[PDB]
Each structure stands twice: as structure tokens, then as C-alpha cells.
Amino acid sequence: YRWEKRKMKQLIKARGYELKGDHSPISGIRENDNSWNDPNPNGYNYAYIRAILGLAEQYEFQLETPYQKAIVKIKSANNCISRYKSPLLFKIIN
RNA sequence: AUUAAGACAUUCGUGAGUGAUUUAUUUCCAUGAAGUGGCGU
Numbered sequence: 224y225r226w227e228k229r230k231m232k233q234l235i236k237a238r239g240y241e242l243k244g245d246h247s248p249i250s251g252i253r254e255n256d257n258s259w260n261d262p263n264p265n266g267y268n269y270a271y272i273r274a275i276l277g278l279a280e281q282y283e284f285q286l287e288t289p290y291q292k293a294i295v296k297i298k299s300a301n302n303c304i305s306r307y308k309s310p311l312l313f314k315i316i317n
Numbered sequence: 318a319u320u321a322a323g324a325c326a327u328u329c330g331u332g333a334g335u336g337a338u339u340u341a342u343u344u345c346c347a348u349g350a351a352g353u354g355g356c357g358u
Contacts, residue, residue, distance in 0.1 A: 228355090244357030255358075277353055285356045292356090306352055 225250070230269040231282060231295050241287045271297075278307035 229248040236242070236259065247257035273279060282295040299305060 242357075246358055249358065257358085279353050279355070281353090281355075283355050295355095308352060 224268050224270050224272060227269065227271050227273055228282070232284070235284065235293060240293065242293075243285045243287050274304075274307060275310065277309035278304065 226248070229250075232242065232248055247259035250256060250258045250262065278297075280297050282297075284293040284295065286293055
């Protein structure tokens with residue numbers, strides 16, 4: 224299981240659209256590795272990892288030129304899960 | 318010409334007087350104006 228963000232950024236570069244930044248999207252847990260390229264001959268698992276810690280709808284991706292943006296918008300694909308409050312609670316007492 | 322004849326059960330007379338469709342009853346019960354951040358390790 225890997226990122227939905229890296230999931231998203233993979234297809235934007237599948238056509239010519241250069242995103243701002245100097246380092247490729249992260250693979251692997253550790254080390255300073257970079258991979259703007261194929262994962263591996265076998266394949267990779269992509270799931271909406273960030274849904275469980277608070278569902279999000281619209282993702283702005285900063286194109287190289289400020290002039291435009293690129294937007295990814297998320298929907299339940301069957302109109303069931305339109306919400307998820309973050310399953311974490313922050314309590315500040317004294 | 319005969320125990321006959323004669324005689325409107327009629328006159329007068331308000332179905333009227335008194336009397337609230339009123340009394341009692343919560344438009345109320347349940348319900349988070351809330352959720353999420355995104356972008357260049």
C-alpha cells in the first residue's frame with residue numbers, strides 16, 4: 224500500500240505537465256531515494272491512505288508555472304462516503 | 318205530517334319562556350453548522 228498522492232502524481236506526468244519541485248516522489252520507507260519512473264516490473268498497490276485520517280475532496284497540485292493549477296477532486300464513486308471526521312481528538316487541559 | 322221541526326263542537330289561545338358548542342389539551346419530540354485541508358524530502 225502506497226500514497227494516493229503519489230498515485231495522483233503518476234498520471235499527471237504521464238502526459239507533459241511538469242510539476243514544481245526538485246525531488247521525485249518518495250518510494251520506500253527510508254533513505255534518500257527518488258523515483259519519477261516505473262515502480263517495478265510486478266506492480267504496486269494504491270489505496271486512499273489519507274481517507275481514514277480525515278476524508279478530503281479536492282487536491283491542488285502546483286504546476287511549474289504559477290499561471291495555472293491542476294486539480295484532483297474525489298467522490299465516493301457510488302455516493303456513499305461523503306464524509307469522515309478525523310478519528311483523532313486533541314484535548315488541551317491546563 | 319209520522320214522540321215531529323229547528324242548531325257547523327264552535328269562540329277565545331304564538332310551541333312559547335329559561336339556556337355561550339362550552340370544558341380539558343404546550344405545535345411538540347429527536348437532531349453537533351458541521352467535515353476535510355492540499356501543494357515542491
